[PDB]
Design an enzyme around this catalytic site. Sequence first.
Site, PDB file in Angstrom:
ATOM      1  N   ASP A  84      10.829  44.260 -20.570  1.00 53.81           N
ATOM      2  CA  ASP A  84       9.705  43.348 -20.355  1.00 53.81           C
ATOM      3  C   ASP A  84      10.184  41.971 -20.789  1.00 53.81           C
ATOM      4  O   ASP A  84      10.377  41.730 -21.961  1.00 53.81           O
ATOM      5  CB  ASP A  84       8.473  43.766 -21.174  1.00 53.81           C
ATOM      6  CG  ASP A  84       7.261  42.841 -20.942  1.00 53.81           C
ATOM      7  OD1 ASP A  84       7.320  41.937 -20.059  1.00 53.81           O
ATOM      8  OD2 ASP A  84       6.218  43.044 -21.614  1.00 53.81           O
TER       9      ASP A  84
ATOM     10  N   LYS B 124       9.873  30.933 -19.044  1.00 55.72           N
ATOM     11  CA  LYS B 124       9.205  31.645 -17.934  1.00 55.72           C
ATOM     12  C   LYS B 124       8.144  30.791 -17.237  1.00 55.72           C
ATOM     13  O   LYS B 124       7.797  31.067 -16.087  1.00 55.72           O
ATOM     14  CB  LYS B 124       8.581  32.943 -18.434  1.00 55.72           C
ATOM     15  CG  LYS B 124       8.143  33.899 -17.344  1.00 55.72           C
ATOM     16  CD  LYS B 124       7.729  35.207 -17.982  1.00 55.72           C
ATOM     17  CE  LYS B 124       7.064  36.167 -16.994  1.00 55.72           C
ATOM     18  NZ  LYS B 124       6.728  37.443 -17.685  1.00 55.72           N
TER      19      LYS B 124
ATOM     20  N   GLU C   7       4.258  43.517 -13.500  1.00 55.77           N
ATOM     21  CA  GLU C   7       3.663  43.864 -14.809  1.00 55.77           C
ATOM     22  C   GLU C   7       2.474  44.847 -14.764  1.00 55.77           C
ATOM     23  O   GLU C   7       2.458  45.846 -15.511  1.00 55.77           O
ATOM     24  CB  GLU C   7       3.293  42.596 -15.583  1.00 55.77           C
ATOM     25  CG  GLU C   7       4.498  41.817 -16.086  1.00 55.77           C
ATOM     26  CD  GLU C   7       4.190  40.368 -16.438  1.00 55.77           C
ATOM     27  OE1 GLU C   7       3.037  39.901 -16.257  1.00 55.77           O
ATOM     28  OE2 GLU C   7       5.146  39.691 -16.860  1.00 55.77           O
TER      29      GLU C   7
ATOM     30  N   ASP D 221      -4.446  41.963 -16.746  1.00 52.02           N
ATOM     31  CA  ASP D 221      -3.209  41.694 -17.467  1.00 52.02           C
ATOM     32  C   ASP D 221      -3.120  40.207 -17.801  1.00 52.02           C
ATOM     33  O   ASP D 221      -2.769  39.406 -16.938  1.00 52.02           O
ATOM     34  CB  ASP D 221      -2.029  42.125 -16.589  1.00 52.02           C
ATOM     35  CG  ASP D 221      -0.700  41.707 -17.128  1.00 52.02           C
ATOM     36  OD1 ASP D 221      -0.546  41.538 -18.356  1.00 52.02           O
ATOM     37  OD2 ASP D 221       0.220  41.537 -16.294  1.00 52.02           O
TER      38      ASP D 221
HETATM   39  N1  LIG Z   1      -4.842  39.194 -31.960  1.00 54.20           N
HETATM   40  C1  LIG Z   1      -4.629  38.293 -30.979  1.00 54.20           C
HETATM   41  N2  LIG Z   1      -5.579  37.410 -30.601  1.00 54.20           N
HETATM   42  C2  LIG Z   1      -5.396  36.497 -29.624  1.00 54.20           C
HETATM   43  N3  LIG Z   1      -4.232  36.390 -28.945  1.00 54.20           N
HETATM   44  C3  LIG Z   1      -3.193  37.224 -29.223  1.00 54.20           C
HETATM   45  C4  LIG Z   1      -3.328  38.243 -30.273  1.00 54.20           C
HETATM   46  N4  LIG Z   1      -2.163  38.908 -30.336  1.00 54.20           N
HETATM   47  C5  LIG Z   1      -1.336  38.366 -29.404  1.00 54.20           C
HETATM   48  N5  LIG Z   1      -1.959  37.369 -28.750  1.00 54.20           N
HETATM   49  C6  LIG Z   1      -1.393  36.539 -27.669  1.00 54.20           C
HETATM   50  O1  LIG Z   1      -0.794  37.345 -26.670  1.00 54.20           O
HETATM   51  C7  LIG Z   1       0.199  36.547 -26.024  1.00 54.20           C
HETATM   52  C8  LIG Z   1       1.447  37.373 -25.857  1.00 54.20           C
HETATM   53  O2  LIG Z   1       1.093  38.565 -25.190  1.00 54.20           O
HETATM   54  P1  LIG Z   1       2.172  39.730 -25.048  1.00 54.20           P
HETATM   55  O3  LIG Z   1       1.681  40.629 -23.954  1.00 54.20           O
HETATM   56  O4  LIG Z   1       2.410  40.338 -26.416  1.00 54.20           O
HETATM   57  O5  LIG Z   1       3.578  39.024 -24.688  1.00 54.20           O
HETATM   58  P2  LIG Z   1       4.073  38.372 -23.302  1.00 54.20           P
HETATM   59  O6  LIG Z   1       2.842  37.871 -22.596  1.00 54.20           O
HETATM   60  O7  LIG Z   1       5.010  37.300 -23.785  1.00 54.20           O
HETATM   61  O8  LIG Z   1       4.766  39.493 -22.569  1.00 54.20           O
HETATM   62  C9  LIG Z   1       0.437  35.316 -26.884  1.00 54.20           C
HETATM   63  O9  LIG Z   1      -0.157  34.184 -26.258  1.00 54.20           O
HETATM   64  C10 LIG Z   1      -0.288  35.633 -28.168  1.00 54.20           C
HETATM   65  O10 LIG Z   1      -0.831  34.476 -28.798  1.00 54.20           O
END
Ligand SMILES: Nc1ncnc2c1ncn2[C@@H]1O[C@H](COP(=O)(O)OP(=O)(O)O)[C@@H](O)[C@H]1O
Length: 520
Positions: A6, A68, A173, A196
């Site tokens: 991922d 990205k 995704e 998503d």
């Molecule tokens: N508890 C939370 N509350 C709000 N936003 C969150 C929380 N945990 C993670 N995020 C947000 O999720 C996003 C990342 O999502 P994730 O699916 O883990 O990674 P990516 O999108 O990089 O693959 C970031 O913007 C992060 O701030």
Amino acid sequence: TVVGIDLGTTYSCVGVFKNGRVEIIANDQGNRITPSYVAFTPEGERLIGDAAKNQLTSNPENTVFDAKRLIGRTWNDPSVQQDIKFLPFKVVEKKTKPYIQVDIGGGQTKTFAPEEISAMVLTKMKETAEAYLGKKVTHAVVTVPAYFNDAQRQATKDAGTIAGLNVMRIINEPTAAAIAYGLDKREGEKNILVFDLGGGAFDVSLLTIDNGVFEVVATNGDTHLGGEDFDQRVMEHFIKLYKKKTGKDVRKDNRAVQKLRREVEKAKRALSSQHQARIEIESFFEGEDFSETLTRAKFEELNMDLFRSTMKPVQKVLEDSDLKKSDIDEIVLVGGSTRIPKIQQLVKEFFNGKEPSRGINPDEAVAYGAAVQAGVLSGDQDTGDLVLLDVCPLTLGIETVGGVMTKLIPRNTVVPTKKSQIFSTASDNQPTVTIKVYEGERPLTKDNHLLGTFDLTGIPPAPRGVPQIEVTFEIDVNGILRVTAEDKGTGNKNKITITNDQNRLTPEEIERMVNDAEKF
Ligand SMILES: Nc1ncnc2c1ncn2[C@@H]1O[C@H](COP(=O)(O)OP(=O)(O)O)[C@@H](O)[C@H]1O
């Protein structure tokens, strides 16, 4: 062994399917996710992941993240120009593309394509897998947002190639998350809605899932909507509030702006379970402190239009699939931004009180699915029988007289797929015919996205309208377009070569980038 990666906006994750289950592989710091960050220290070393993220606020100009959000985009894309205001590293135009310029120590400067930064992240994820497995990894399945366009998909594949990976398959995704959800379910045919919302991009997909057969029926998204934008709305609120209260504009002091980012990110996460959060920055700007309390109410208000805009793709998917809200059997929430209570509330209220599926970590579901797909494509026999039918996200069309979008391949068509059409000349002895291909759903091409301009060259001398050149447009299983041509005229057949304006990274250019990365 094929791995699943991922490659996320904010984090990346690598997994493998072994002994009948997925292992999400921990990095050298013991973390199951790795920040998608690369930094260059004044002493000359390249840092990747947690170590890069940890020195953002002391070396902001030479710390790269959110690649990205730039990958596969052109310089004049509004989402690139809008994001520049919040990024501390210099973004410069080269090859009509946003390149990243940094200092690498000793008064020296280097410029990187977004592909090259993402290749450094992929290299780290590959090395993480190699340490765990004790052997070389050469093949991978890599994730992309479902709504990524042709250029974004190809640029991600190129990042893989630069990192020494044969990218066997690009996986969307939501489809990966659906596999994580639905693997080994032996229930009847179910309609699954995957919502998503990650760090950078938003996708909605409706799938049918029936005893290992997964089909995407419809998809729609926004490739520049995610958690990073929610942070940046709050950042801009405080940058403006500071200038109003003090007269000082902090938007050029990169340390101030990125200290604010760090604090806003922390507060946002806190506000998913608390109703208030304290932002504190010692030495914000010109050695002065910054203290503000952010309430959940204020966070929601600053972002409400963005939060409410996530319902637009949901309705678009229901309309394309011809399904009612009540036909949706499960809602699968994925991406870390789905942890935001207001997002959960908006989705729950749209579907008249229906709760999302339990037992799914929204931060890890995508990596889990990619790992399963990697195991299946390897030839593993201890996985379930997985059959996947995925689609192209965008209508492909050709520009015709009056700037009109003439459709070639409609959105939501299962890939691979192809369409052919005969072209001819408008003038006597015309040697070249030009075809402009667009992606999008609007009726005029000026309101869609240019995929590329393709030139049919080497057309032999002949009167106008006599040549008959069959052009084939094929979208492969990765969602990427290839255009080819064949002379269908009577008598001596001529070779018709196609040139384009896509500015693909050539094998020569990729080789140079591989050699440049090894210097760090
Ligand atoms: N508890 C939370 N509350 C709000 N936003 C969150 C929380 N945990 C993670 N995020 C947000 O999720 C996003 C990342 O999502 P994730 O699916 O883990 O990674 P990516 O999108 O990089 O693959 C970031 O913007 C992060 O701030």
